[PDB]
Amino acid sequence: PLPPDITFDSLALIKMHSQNMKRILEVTLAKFTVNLSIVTVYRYLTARLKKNIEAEFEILKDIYNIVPLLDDIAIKAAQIEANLIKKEITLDMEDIITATTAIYTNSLLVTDDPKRYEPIRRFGLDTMPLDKFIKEVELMVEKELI
Amino acid sequence: PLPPDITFDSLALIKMHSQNMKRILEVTLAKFTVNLSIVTVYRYLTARAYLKKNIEAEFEILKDIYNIVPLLDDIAIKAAQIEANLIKKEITLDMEDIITATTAIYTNSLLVTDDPKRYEPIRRFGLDTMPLDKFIKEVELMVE
């Protein structure tokens, strides 16, 4: 079964807000606590040129638990990335902070590209492909109603 | 001269903590308020962690001498506002640069960097920068 706390990276969050995902997003918000790193929120607001920024942020802050780049997160992220650099791995800032925040909040990281975060698994990170997450949420709903 | 509030980006910070900059550092810490973005601190500590330093202890020191600025909601908002305005005109900078510059604007801090040119597109939003070499020269005068 899916845990209570989950999170998404920017790309997955963008998909969760697509028009054909409206019902699944509604169910997800009703059943889980979504803990988004402020960096994910930032990337969501930029990659997404269409609407209004400050207004969009208020909406996100109202439906999601936005997690700051807390001191403890900055420290752990530096430790994790330093360990990866030695192993010759290329993760950008957004990915490192997103994964570290997920570990800190004990949230399952839902993403379309779990493989990219694989090197962080040994540090306590748990991931799940977005497609599988969606199917599990669908199954949850079906069980509730049938 | 130099304003009351200043900040450094990652490379400038490294240099400010280097051995032959010890004198300049503490004259800076005594005369100005340095507002460092937590993003800059993260980059700095990543290098220190690679060198197997006790970054928890070093962070405590940074906290005691610098005003560490969180990636505040308002900073995230202003940064997104800036990046999308820049993207409108084929201009793109990495996240660290946008947040660092936005934080300097937010705290009314002069951004001291060894590469002022890459921040040029953000000056239109109110950012003021000063090359590191020039900052060092001015502090040296104060050192007397």
Quote the CA–CA distance of B115 and B107 in Å, as a whole number.
20
In the DSSP assignment, the letter for residue B136 is H
- Which residue blocks in chain B are alpha helix, DSSP H? 10-16, 22-31, 38-50, 55-65, 73-87, 95-106, 132-143
Q: At what angle do helices A53-63 and B73-87 cross, to 10 degrees?
A: 140
CB contact at 8 A, A41 and B72: no
> Minimal Cα distance from B79: which residue of A?
A42
Q: Is A66 on the interface with B (CB under 8 A)?
A: yes
Architecture of the structural domain at B1-144: 3-Layer(aba) Sandwich (3.40)
Which residues between 23 and 52 in chain A have a beta carbon less than 8 angstroms from any beta carbon of chain B? 38-39, 41-43, 45-46, 49
Cα maximum dimension of chain B? 47
B89 three-class SS: coil
Quote the CA–CA distance of B43 and B10 in Å, as a whole number.
7
CB contact at 8 A, B10 and B45: no
Question: Which numeric CATH code is attached to A1-146?
Answer: 3.40.50.1010
Quote the CA–CA distance of B41 and B63 in Å, as a whole number.
10
**Which residues of A define the annotated binding site for Mg(2+)?**
9, 95
Give the HSE-up count for residue B117: Cα atoms under 13 Å, Cβ half-sphere: 1
Quote the CA–CA distance of B71 and B109 in Å, as a whole number.
15
CB contact at 8 A, A114 and A127: yes
CB contact at 8 A, B18 and B114: no
Quote the CA–CA distance of A37 and A49 in Å, as a whole number.
21
Give the HSE-up count for residue B50: Cα atoms under 13 Å, Cβ half-sphere: 12
Quote the CA–CA distance of B75 and B134 in Å, as a whole number.
28
Residues in chain A: 146
Residue ranges of the domains in chain B?
A: 1-144
Q: Is B108 on the interface with A (CB under 8 A)?
A: no
In the DSSP assignment, the letter for residue B70 is P
Strand order of the β-sheet with B110-113 is: B67-69, B33-37, B5-8, B110-113, B129-131
Experimental structure resolution, Å: 1.8
User: Where is chain A discontinuous (C–N over 2.5 Å), named by the preceding residue?
Assistant: 48
Please name which of A146, A110, A79 lies closest in space to residue A10, comparing C-alpha atoms: A110
Structure-solving method: X-ray
Placement of tokens 């990337």 in the chain? A43
Quote the CA–CA distance of B19 and B95 in Å, as a whole number.
29
Q: How far is CA A17 from the centre of its chain?
A: 13
Measured in degrees and rounded to the nearest 5, phi and psi for residue A63 equal -100, -20
Q: Inspect the interface and report whether the beta carbons of A66 and B73 lie closer than 8 Å.
A: yes
Tokens of A43: 């990337």
Tokens of A126: 């748990």
Tokens of B4: 């009351």
Task: Count residue pairs from A and B with Cβ separation < 8 A.
Answer: 84
